[PDB]
Subunit: 454 residues, 3 copies
Amino acid sequence: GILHYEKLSKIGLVKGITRKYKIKSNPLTKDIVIKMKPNVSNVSKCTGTVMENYKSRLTGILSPIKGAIELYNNNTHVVMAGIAIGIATAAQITAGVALYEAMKNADNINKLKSSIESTNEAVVKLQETAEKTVYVLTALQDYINTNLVPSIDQISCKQTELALDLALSKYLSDLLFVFGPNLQDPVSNSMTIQAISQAFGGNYETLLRTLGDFDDLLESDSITGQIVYVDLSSYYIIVRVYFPILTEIQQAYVQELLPVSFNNDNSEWISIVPNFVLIRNTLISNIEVKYCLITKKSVICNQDYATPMTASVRECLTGSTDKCPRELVVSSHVPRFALSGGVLFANCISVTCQCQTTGRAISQSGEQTLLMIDNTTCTTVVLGNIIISLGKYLGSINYNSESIAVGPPVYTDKVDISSQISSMNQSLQQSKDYIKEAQKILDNVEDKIEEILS
Amino acid sequence: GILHYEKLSKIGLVKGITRKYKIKSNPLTKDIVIKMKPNVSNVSKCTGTVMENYKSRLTGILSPIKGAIELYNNNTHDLVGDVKLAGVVMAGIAIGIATAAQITAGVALYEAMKNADNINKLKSSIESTNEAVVKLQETAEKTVYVLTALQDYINTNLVPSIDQISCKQTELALDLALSKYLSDLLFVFGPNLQDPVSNSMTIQAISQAFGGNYETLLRTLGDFDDLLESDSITGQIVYVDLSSYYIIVRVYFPILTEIQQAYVQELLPVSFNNDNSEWISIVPNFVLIRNTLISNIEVKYCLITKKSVICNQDYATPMTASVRECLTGSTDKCPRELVVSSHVPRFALSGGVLFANCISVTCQCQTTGRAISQSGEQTLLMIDNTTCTTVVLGNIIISLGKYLGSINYNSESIAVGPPVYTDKVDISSQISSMNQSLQQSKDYIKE
Amino acid sequence: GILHYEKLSKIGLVKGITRKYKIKSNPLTKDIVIKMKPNVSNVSKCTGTVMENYKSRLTGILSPIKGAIELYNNNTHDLVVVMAGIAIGIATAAQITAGVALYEAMKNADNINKLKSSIESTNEAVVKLQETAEKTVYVLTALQDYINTNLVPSIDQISCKQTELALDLALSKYLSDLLFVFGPNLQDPVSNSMTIQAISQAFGGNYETLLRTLGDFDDLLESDSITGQIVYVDLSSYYIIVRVYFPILTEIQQAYVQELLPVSFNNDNSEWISIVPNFVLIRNTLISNIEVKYCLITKKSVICNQDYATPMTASVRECLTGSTDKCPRELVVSSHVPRFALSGGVLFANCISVTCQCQTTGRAISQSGEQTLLMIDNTTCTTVVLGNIIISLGKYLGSINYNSESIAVGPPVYTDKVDISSQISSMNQSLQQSKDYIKE
Ligand SMILES: *[C@@H]1O[C@H](CO)[C@@H](O[C@@H]2O[C@H](CO)[C@@H](O)[C@H](O)[C@H]2NC(C)=O)[C@H](O)[C@H]1NC(C)=O
Ligand SMILES: *[C@@H]1O[C@H](CO)[C@@H](O[C@@H]2O[C@H](CO)[C@@H](O)[C@H](O)[C@H]2NC(C)=O)[C@H](O)[C@H]1NC(C)=O
Ligand SMILES: *[C@@H]1O[C@H](CO)[C@@H](O)[C@H](O)[C@H]1NC(C)=O
Ligand SMILES: *[C@@H]1O[C@H](CO)[C@@H](O)[C@H](O)[C@H]1NC(C)=O
Ligand SMILES: *[C@@H]1O[C@H](CO)[C@@H](O)[C@H](O)[C@H]1NC(C)=O
């Protein structure tokens, strides 16, 4: 049950931190306008057909989004038109419902079109008639206002236009990854606010700040954006930002296991067991922490990332160490000792351990996997080049007298898995014929005992 | 033959979109000059030895490319039987050890040489280009473009701030720009690009030398976006000039062809019920069918799109006969895995008909007012307008079509495949477990 | 020596380059100050509360580093260096060692810190300061250049909100850029893994200047061997001290990395590719796998920031050393897996899959169905036309009749993630099914 830490530590898995488990929930919606063509009316003398190009270029990347969105709109007549939609995922359907929900306010924001069209500055605060405000973030506007405008004199009219064309095209080449043919499904709310901000030049800080515990959300990619309206004549979008909160899962924790090479039968092994185990309620399972934000106190995820675990690997973690698979160590880099509870767990065959206080070297038998070193043999431990003072071990009084039973060896390598598999299939097939040497030589040579009876 | 779509949909894999399959082919080559040191002729007043430094710094990252390229140029002693279009001969002994890809890139390099040499004659005019992008005449009426790094910054920041800023400031700002640009280009062009006799480099990646602005680079040259987002527009470095600090890039702008009777079928996955628990099917979500043959495809590397999967190469991959069999009827061969996340999807829509896990989620009929409840004997419900016109599904209301398949999808039971664990760590334990077991029962056969 | 290159080449793995094996060692520490709030007193006019905001914002991302660092400092009580095990409680070796290095950095950190008020008022982007000894120390300050060469000149023709917008925007952009590396994300700052590139995110990614002010550099850089450790955080002046670990790389002895160039091959009416590592590490008499993906591959060497060796199954070992019937093979279904390679100036080609011909002798080079691959050298063709590429050949230094002698092909296998589970469960099902007949 709920983890056999000591048994585990001998096989080279020492207790790491225990962590709180958190997931986003309870989203909270807020709307923003991002304008994708800058102002220019203040510096319109020496532009040329850069705009006529940029616009039709932008229209090419923008229109298919509009098109994709509108297929959910003309076809949600609360109720979504299943025949019209035809083939879709639940996720998408829900995004579509959120979209329809956004429409009501989208429509009200859209009434300020001509005022959006003529925004002077980078970030503008507008009045949506209610006393409910709405923000317009316009791309390259700052550059235009504070580079182009003041350098106008010392540049000329054929080289301001170059500087403009270049800015526009750079901005384009930057936004293209996120907003290209690439975002094929824009009826979603997965797009991270960071990724959306690409349209405002990656400055998601300002985007969040004008809307007004933050970083933890941000670095879990839990702050998401949904595109809810596209205006093709004014070249702006409305984004609904989903700013959630994060909730602690109840009697759920994520246990880290610190891996440490260990000795068996003249060679160093490392245990093949998850380094992060999720325990919620009485149930132990795998978790894909790679997708979360690990943190001193908590694993923070934008969704549940639990994953099933085989009963062997479950048994392994709760005592049966002869079920934890082990792999050969051949790199001078897999770690050779760890510290847990102020007590040291060390491969004193691989590395040389000594007692600074008592002067005598701490030497490890070949019969043992690992040493548990605490303040009842050394107070201070010299460990190569690092000197470390130890606590008393809260576990078994004679950890080092009692021997763990090591599990089976295995190869972890992609290429070695296939060879192992074909090797095995070979062996099982080879010995699946000897079992067919009994369909005759135990059936006919026993139904001959019906004739040698009758 | 066909995928057994109905049998599949019970095991929680519903028909998604069917897509065209496209791959790039027939490049149309076009050449461009990228100059990697800006002008500074209109600034040379406060420049310390930052140019003297920057140059020798750049030479360090540039020269080995040149060197690498020129080993193919000395080694292709070619035109075969002297003549231009007769062909090209690569020196095998000289080259020694190379890949087909590389050899071909070498041939393309030799092919680029002819025009490279003609472009190179404008060296002194490249050397003194004033502006960021310049159009030059290669004598023929055939034009050639020079894109020069940091030039714009220099022309529109520094020259304008020169009257208002000092010296050990004007030079700081320059040193900083140059070193930033350097630290940005270093990933793509460093010791990293060990094999420059290639045409893999994407034009985006190449444009790192022009500060990531691949837009302008493409636009000065001339289905564009679909090419671009499949990384099918590639660049090859064909000449390096170490005194003028410029490179010639051959850009390979291809076209994309529809593969014939080949389509990529999406399967939308849906959690399904069996023996008191939710399972998800372990079967590819994307299957490539070309001709009568079904095989895997690595779409992760392609560009997926309403109508088509667009790839810069063929990405087909073999498929085990079991997983083949599974997709064409034998659902007892489709492996399944336990579901333990409140996130794996619980229903899908295909053909206007709903496939739902009405054990996991709670389904009801808005029109008929009665809840749609699912037996524990069944994996999944197919709900079509012949039981509900409108379906309330938690919080989403949805109007349905008539299912074009079996009149009683729900009365007939599928046979669920074997359970399996998908996890990296779990595969090793499963394997060692099995070895142990087979060895253990390989002695009883010796009894 | 170790490997069986000829036997291997028939199964479609031809000798590629042999490379030197190098790892970083012998690091060489040098210190630097990164200031994360620009000067701005030269436009202290209409900034507004943006500084008051920016500062408290920054404090939020910065303080937890300080905090984390100081827990090692508070708990290394020494000179004998002794680390407090009870206080530390639960840590890795790596981290402990980082801690020792941190304590080692403290001595100089403390001396650098005396110049606090002079750090506070640095005018320019990069400054050289005197740490009293004649030992200099550098201050790189963020956004300073932008401020000095955009905003200060663009004061005169810009409104008071206009100036402050441009500032707020620069600051917040810089923030949104640094946040990935320095956020809640860097949960363990008592380490020296952070690459100097990643560190330079605080100076706006310009790791070039950072390295250049401190003074075979690229190979280090592109192996991510040049690392930074944060050794001090100042929360009132908003600067950090970084100890940069600039190592040197050493050749491993009698160790090389062998590349294998893969080439589709023919067997029993279909094209196969061999499932064998493309890079094999041989050090001493021992052959093993190596994870090159993490290193820097280079004409002469594989360059790694650590040893990346990995064990190899005795079957795959045996395979590379003769037993080709142990090298697993997989069916080819993509018009993209390569069809010929060149090694030693001799050609190894699938002349069933592609059509091979002799330009010199005019006659086409055709391959039996009994053979996997053709070895083509100048003793049959001097020049070879191979689709659209013409190539002149050397003499093969191996067996005089490579093409008469047949290799024994290994077992077929499926490589695919999804196909492994089915293979595994199939093998299970079958073993269970035939584990009952043994109970009969
Ligand atoms: C769905 O309906 C939208 C409107 O909601 C359609 O947009 C119209 O587009 C035409 C262009 O030919 C314009 O003349 C109209 O002004 C638009 N309609 C309205 C009411 O403003 C769109 O064509 C429809 N189709 C799809 C597939 O989304
Ligand atoms: C159940 O769904 C089918 C197909 O979605 C509906 O049949 C269509 O009805 C519309 C409107 O009457 C016609 O324009 C189509 O031509 C019909 N298609 C077919 C293939 O018959 C049907 O109406 C739905 N049933 C109910 C009760 O709404
Ligand atoms: C070991 O740990 C702590 C040190 O304070 C203490 O409680 C205990 O008495 C110590 N025991 C010995 C034998 O040193
Ligand atoms: C370290 O100790 C001092 C007390 O003298 C205190 O000011 C500081 O906050 C402590 N920090 C930690 C992390 O314990
Ligand atoms: C192959 O090439 C080299 C040329 O130096 C030579 O050693 C060898 O004799 C050649 N043989 C033939 C048949 O061309």
